[PDB]
Each structure stands twice: as structure tokens, then as C-alpha cells.
DNA sequence: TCAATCAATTGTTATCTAAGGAAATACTTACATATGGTTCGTGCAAACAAACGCAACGAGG
């Protein structure tokens, strides 16, 4: 669960970074500072919970690989 | 016939220099209320951070 927690934290932080701390705050309903500080404080803890809760999702690179394979075959 | 001087009792102070050895543990007021401090998540502005566009400069041709 340790490495799953690390993976989930990395995926979450990547999603926030891609969407944008400012944009993520605007969509969530908080201030950019709140997202910036959740990234430091709770995202690791929530990530460990997800690792235990077994909510891990497919890594996006392998997702792109699967999409490409499904396009090439079909 | 009082007091200056001996005499026994009481209290204070002293007993070498270094190196090793680690310390311990009984002896239980309780329930309620006011207040206030501390922790925590938030917002706002400030303070950094990335990545360009433009212009000036200074070397190359």
C-alpha cells in the first residue's frame, strides 16, 4: 500500500498541475492558496487512504498506449 | 558575700590525589461551569516563478 499511496499521490499532483492550481481552485470553490497547501499537507494522506481504499486508477502513459493500440488494431 | 577566674559541657570545623561506576521504584478529590487558549482551515494580498516579445548591443561577415 506504500507504493500504491506514492503512485496515487503522484497521479493526483500531476492532475492538479495539468489543470492548474488557479484553475483547480476556481473549479473546486476555494482559493489558489488552498490548493497549493492541500498539495503539501493532505494530498499524501488522502493518497494513502486511496491506496488502502483501493481506488487507484490507470497511469496516463499506459492509458495513451492502450488508446494507440486500440486505434492501430481497429 | 560579690564577682574574676578555672573547669566541664556544647557546638563548630577539619580529615591525600586521581581515575571507574550511571539514577530508580509507597503515600489515590470528583463533578460542574466559565473562559480562554490552541489548532486548523480559509481568504487576500504579497511575493516568487516561467516563458515570451521587443529592443539595444556587439560581434560576425
From Swiss-Prot:
The superkingdom listed in its UniProt entry is Viruses
Whereabouts does the entry annotate DNA binding, in residue ranges?
Answer: 21-40
GO-annotated biological processes:
regulation of DNA-templated transcription; viral latency
Q: Which GO terms describe its molecular function?
A: DNA binding
According to UniProt, the name of this protein is Transcriptional activator II
The family annotation for this protein states: Belongs to the lambda phage cII protein family.
Q: How does it assemble?
A: Homotetramer. Interacts with cIII; this interaction is essential to stabilize cII that would otherwise be quickly degraded by host protease FtsH.
What more the UniProt record tells us is: Lambda-imm434 is a hybrid of bacteriophages 434 and lambda. The cII protein coding region is in the lambda portion of the imm434 genome.
* Keywords from the named record: Activator, DNA-binding, Early protein, Transcription, Transcription regulation, Viral latency, Viral latency initiation and maintenance
Q: Tell me the function of this protein.
A: Acts as a transcriptional activator that allows virus to initiate a latent state. Following infection, participates, together with cIII, in activation of the Pe and Pi promoters, which are responsible for the transcription of the cI (repressor) and int (integrase) genes, respectively. Both of these gene products are required for the establishment of latency.
